Design a protein around this nucleic acid. Structure first.
Length: 49
DNA sequence: GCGGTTTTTTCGCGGGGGTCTGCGCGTTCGTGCGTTTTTGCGGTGCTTGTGCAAAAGAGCGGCCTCGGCACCGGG
């Protein structure tokens, strides 16, 4: 979370392959897929802090 | 100190392949969050106790004059 000016810019990161979560290979938070593209982060702003 | 022997140090060149290194992902161990069990200094209410105006008569002690006597000196 980063309050830049009057807007609060919060970047929500999501699980993405390549040294991501500390979870072991046995259980993956996503389905295995070389052709799968992932939403890595979304940044939102709001006037209400 | 001076002359001898001859080992193994210094000199250089070629080839091999184990070690270093670029790159990636994962994890395990370093670092912060939170807590357990106990030690310590902080204060109080109450206990137990302390230093800081004449008038008059009655009675008294000191004192003094005096009484009266015993005594020294002499024969």
């Amino acid at each position: 979370k980063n309050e830049e000016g009057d807007y609060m810019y919060i970047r929500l990161n999501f699980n993405s392959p390549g040294m991501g979560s500390s979870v072991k290979k046995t259980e993956l938070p996503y389905e295995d897929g070389d052709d799968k593209e992932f939403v890595r982060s979304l940044t939102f702003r709001s006037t209400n802090k």
